[PDB]
Design a protein around this ligand. Structure first.
Ligand code: M3Y
Length: 272
């Protein structure tokens, strides 16, 4: 990763929290192309000081994805490790995370919008699968909306997939349980079962989010009941707008070897 000076970063408003992280809008002063000076809007992800021992995982997450370049993967500018903080410096996406966008705009989001966003997320995951790179935390909060749909110009929305954060292979067990049903059943059994097939299951959970206007699946269940949901081999309920429900259930297959490839997933989506 490129090293960025603390002196060149300005922290502005808080944009919320992630797992053991705090998120801020900021500005980076930099010399750009042709030697021209720029002040660039950035997203700053800050690892909690009391959790500095997760920094290896925090940064290995961002590093692995940033060794590949793709139009549907978020751009990382570098890191700032000046002094006591661990900071990931990332492109600032105008419209933020998909989960809060769906909640605030669920009135004005139709099947064609959901299908376009689903196709774009599948394209990103197909790219990862072809490169045998595991993401490990596919979810609507980790989808960023670069551009809104503009029917007046026939422009579709455009999304990017963010970095996965601290791996489920090092997180506390109670956090993994709270992440049911994004974390697949085999990873609750053994977090070291993390595999390419992990991302197929979470992709299904994420489609459910996209179809449910920002609702969180199984949010009414506490962690003990989320565990028993998997023990009883239940599936999620079909969303009210059910056009994608069969694809959701096909992806959320309790047998990891039976989950469809992303090529097959893209073929399905192209049939609707
Ligand atoms: N790269 C990036 N850009 C933005 N932009 C943004 C814009 C507007 C809003 S708001 N509150 O006005 O709706 C919030 C955020 N967010 N972001 C990001 O990575 N978020 C994130 C993802 C996963 C976990 C934690 C944080």
């Amino acid at each position: 990763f490129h090293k960025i000076r603390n002196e060149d970063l300005i922290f502005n408003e808080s944009l919320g929290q992630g797992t053991f992280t705090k998120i801020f809008k900021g500005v980076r002063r930099e010399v750009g192309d042709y030697g021209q000076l720029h002040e660039t809007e950035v997203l700053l992800k800050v690892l909690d000081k009391a959790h500095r021992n997760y920094s290896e995982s925090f940064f290995e997450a961002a590093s692995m994805m940033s060794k590949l370049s793709h139009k549907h993967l978020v751009l990382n500018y570098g890191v700032c490790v000046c002094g006591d903080e661990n900071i990931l410096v990332q492109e600032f996406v105008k419209f933020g995370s998909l989960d809060t966008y769906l909640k605030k705009n669920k009135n004005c989001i139709n099947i064609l919008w959901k299908l376009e966003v689903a196709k774009q997320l599948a394209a990103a995951m197909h790219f990862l699968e072809e490169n045998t790179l595991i993401h490990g935390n596919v979810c609507a909060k980790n989808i960023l909306l670069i551009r809104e749909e503009d029917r007046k110009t026939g422009n579709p929305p455009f999304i990017k997939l963010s970095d996965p954060g601290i791996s489920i292979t090092v997180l506390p067990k109670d956090i993994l349980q709270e992440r049911i049903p994004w974390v697949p059943p085999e990873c609750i059994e053994n977090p070291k079962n993390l595999n390419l097939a992990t991302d197929k299951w979470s992709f299904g959970t994420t489609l459910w989010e996209i179809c449910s206007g920002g609702d969180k699946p199984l949010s009414a269940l506490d962690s003990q009941r989320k565990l028993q949901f998997y023990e009883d081999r239940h599936q999620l309920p079909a969303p009210k707008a059910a056009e994608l429900a069969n694809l959701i259930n096909n992806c959320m297959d309790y047998e990891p070897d039976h989950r469809p490839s992303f090529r097959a997933i893209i073929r399905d989506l192209n049939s609707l």
